[PDB]
């Protein structure tokens, strides 16, 4: 009996009354439209935006911390080399804006040097993320933005084959170029190659080298695309699992262990992967919200008053929209709770408070690599956690409106069976 | 995973009340927390919120008159209500934002001459 039931749960009485009133239903639909714009159209104030930004910053920060300590070297087929120095520019090396891969004789692979092939995948992804962070991520609903990325690397030493036409695609080591494209959007890559002799005016360094430039045009900068690069970054590090060896300054923060393999940061890498996975799921809710627009007013038909049992076929759509928005908000929250140091403990807390959520540069803009980036995050992780919380706090009214609307729709989906 | 409000009662208009919430650590720690209320014939309404670092924000209906605060050492959340009007009459509830799906029992506030 329903009177018995509503005397105990008078909010349900109110809900049923709202569900039978086109004017309250339309008010709830309007709210969903305004909460959707807050989530997928805004930047500062969107918890979904702040969480996507946090997932990417954490991946990028992870490398800024440990990249300088990571061994890499060898030749082009993942094989050991005799005297190959391959240097990747705009990377957070030890007191340097390059990382130098010059470990010879050891076979690349697990608990050994990262292969140059793996460093190339990692570096390309790092360059795209840093360029994008520097320009600013767009709001989630923006899928056709692009960025231009340029990066360089050099090969020197007898027998170094990582800069060779055969590997690079190019025709001639000195002067050649190559254009190639790939994919739902076309990205065009322009590779060009140059040789600098040891005995050539302007060559500070002792030695002959080849310089490779890659210019990528039309790289997409949407959340999905960038989350895919972050995942490529973190998964290449974890799968390749190279040897690292750290330098601890006396005084500041101490890294244990001091030597080992990068996979060995199992808590850290798991967390980042989870953040990225949750942020992918979160961004996917955007197509659900887009598919089920709520801007069309609803009401009775051919003269009659609204009938909640027959006129409510829009409810399924309203329920899916509302639930997707709630899911975005919950996943955003979850992303923050994965990395927030207030709830971490031991090794992992120390890694975040001491290293990841720290910058040693002289707020320099996002995406900047200096000679002091190394052993620190420099990806705005503290600021981004704070802003995620600020935006959740500023989403109080909208969250209650999303719940009201989910409940109204759910009441109509039940009445409609 | 638990929430427990207290401090409500019947007061006169112009009056003042301090509400408390005892939350569990898993709810409270590192989370934005806030207060809500549910007035007669209406659905639950968001009232105030506060970040882990202590920055508060308020709904227009209470801004200037209520103050939200948190004690991070005891997982307590507080709401100081001043200049009460009959329209502040409601069951008040606390939660984290976004909300844990099981609410506490609430505390009744009635303002009336
Ligand atoms: C190992 C290397 O880089 N070889 C180059 C060679 O460099 C040597 C010369 O510059 C001589 C000049 O006297 O000096 C040597 O360094 C000296 C230094 O000057 C001294 O001051 C120091 O005390 O000692 C060192 C030596 O111990 C340099 O090693 O230069 C030639 C000319 O630039 C270069 O060949 C040209 O470019 C190549 C790609 C090709 O087009 C040739 O036809 C050109 O003549 C040598 O490159 C190698 O050349 C080979 C053919 O003979 C192969 O082509 C080989 O793959 C090339 O090496 C590759 O390309 C290099 C530019 C570099 O990136 C290597 O790491 C890479 O394997």
Cα A152 to Cα A89, A101, A292, A350, B13: the distances in Å are: 6, 14, 45, 34, 72
Q: Which two tokens stand for residue B26?
A: 């898993």
Q: CB within 8 A of A345, min separation 6: which ones?
A: none
Considering only the beta carbons, identify the residue of A340, A396, A404 that sits closest to B97.
Answer: A396
CA A211 – CA A141 distance, rounded (Å): 39
The secondary structure of chain A in percent helix, strand, coil, rounded to multiples of 5, reads: 50, 15, 35
Beta bridge partners of A73: A115
* Residues 379-398 (A) with a CB less than 8 A from some CB of B: 386, 389-390, 392-397
> Which atom of ligand 1 is nearest to A198's Cα?
10
Å resolution of this model? Answer: 2.4
Answer yes or no: are the C-beta atoms of A345 and A271 closer than 8 Å: no
Judge if the beta carbon of residue A173 lies within 6 A of ligand 1: yes
Helix axes A266-291, A315-339, angle to 10 degrees: 160
Best residue of B1, B24, B28, B32 to probe chain A, by most A CBs closer than 10 Å: B32
With tokens 């975005």, the residue in question is A328
In chain A, what residues touch B43 (CB-CB under 8 Å)?
11, 14-15, 18, 400, 404
Please name which of A234, A235, A260 lies closest in space to residue A246, comparing C-alpha atoms.
Answer: A260
With tokens 């939660």, the residue in question is B95
Cα A246 to Cα A69, A94, A171, A243, A374: the distances in Å are: 5, 10, 40, 10, 10
* Residues 125-184 (A) with a CB less than 8 A from some CB of B: none
Q: Which domains does chain B have, with CATH numbers?
A: 1-113 (2.60.40.10)
Q: How many CB atoms lie within 10 A of CB A267?
A: 16
Cα A399 to Cα A36, A101, A333, A338, B95: the distances in Å are: 11, 50, 12, 21, 12
How do B66-71 and B56-58 pair as beta strands? unpaired
How do B9-11 and B107-111 pair as beta strands? parallel
> Which atom of ligand 1 is nearest to A158's Cα?
1
CA Rg value for chain B: 13
Answer yes or no: are the C-beta atoms of B49 and B68 closer than 8 Å: yes
Beta bridge partners of A214: A151, A191
With tokens 């040897």, the residue in question is A243
Residue whose Cα lies nearest atom 6 of ligand 1: it is: A208
Q: Which two tokens stand for residue A131?
A: 């360029």
């Amino acid at each position: 009996n329903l009177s018995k039931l509503l005397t105990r749960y008078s909010t349900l009485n109110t809900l049923i009354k709202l569900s039978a009133d086109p004017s309250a239903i339309n008010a709830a639909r309007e709210n969903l439209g305004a909460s959707a714009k807050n989530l997928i159209g805004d930047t500062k104030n969107s918890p979904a935006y702040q969480a996507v930004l946090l997932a990417i910053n954490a991946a990028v920060g992870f490398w800024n911390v440990l990249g300088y300590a990571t061994q890499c070297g060898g030749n082009a087929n993942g094989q050991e080399s005799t005297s190959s120095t391959t240097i990747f520019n705009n990377e957070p090396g030890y007191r340097s804006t390059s990382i130098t891969c010059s470990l010879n004789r050891y076979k690349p692979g697990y608990y050994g040097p990262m292969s140059i092939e793996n460093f190339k995948k990692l570096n390309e992804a790092y360059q795209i993320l840093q360029t994008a962070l520097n320009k600013g991520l767009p709001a989630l609903k923006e899928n056709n933005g692009t960025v231009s990325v340029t990066y360089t690397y050099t090969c020197s030493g007898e027998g170094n084959d990582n800069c060779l036409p055969k590997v690079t695609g190019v025709d001639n080591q000195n002067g050649g170029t190559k254009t190639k494209t790939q994919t739902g959007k076309t990205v065009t890559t322009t590779i060009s190659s140059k040789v600098v002799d040891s005995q050539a005016k302007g060559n500070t360094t002792r030695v002959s080298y080849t310089e490779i430039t890659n210019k990528l045009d039309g790289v997409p900068d949407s959340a999905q695309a960038l989350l895919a690069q972050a995942s490529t970054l973190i998964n290449t590090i974890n799968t390749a699992c190279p040897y690292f060896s750290v330098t601890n300054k006396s005084g500041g923060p101490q890294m244990e262990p001091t030597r080992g393999k990068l996979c060995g940061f199992t808590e850290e890498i798991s967390a980042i992967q989870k953040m990225i996975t949750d942020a992918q799921e979160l961004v996917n809710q955007t197509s659900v919200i887009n598919e089920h627009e709520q801007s069309t007013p609803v009401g009775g038909n051919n003269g009659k008053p609204f009938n909640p049992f027959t006129d409510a076929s829009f409810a399924q759509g309203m329920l899916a929209n509302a639930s997707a928005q709630a899911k975005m908000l919950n996943l955003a929250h979850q992303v923050g709770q994965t990395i927030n140091p207030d709830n971490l403990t031991g090794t992992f807390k120390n890694f975040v408070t001491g290293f990841l959520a720290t910058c040693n540069n002289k707020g320099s803009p996002p995406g900047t690599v200096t000679t002091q980036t190394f052993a620190s995050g420099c990806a705005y992780v503290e600021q981004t956690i704070t802003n995620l919380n600020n935006s959740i706090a500023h989403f109080g009214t909208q969250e209650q409106q999303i719940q009201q609307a989910e409940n109204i729709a759910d009441t109509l989906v039940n009445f409609g069976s | 995973v638990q929430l427990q409000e207290s401090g409500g009662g019947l007061v006169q208009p112009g009056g003042s009340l301090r509400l408390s919430c005892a939350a569990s650590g898993s709810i409270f720690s590192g989370n934005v927390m806030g207060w809500y209320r549910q007035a007669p014939g209406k659905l639950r309404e968001w009232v105030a919120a506060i970040t882990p670092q202590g920055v508060p924000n308020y709904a227009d209906s209470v801004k200037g008159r209520f103050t939200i605060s948190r004690d991070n050492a005891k997982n307590m959340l507080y709401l100081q209500m001043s200049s009460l009007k009959p329209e502040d009459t409601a069951l008040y509830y606390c939660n984290r934002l976004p909300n844990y799906r099981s609410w506490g029992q609430g505390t009744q506030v009635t303002v009336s001459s």
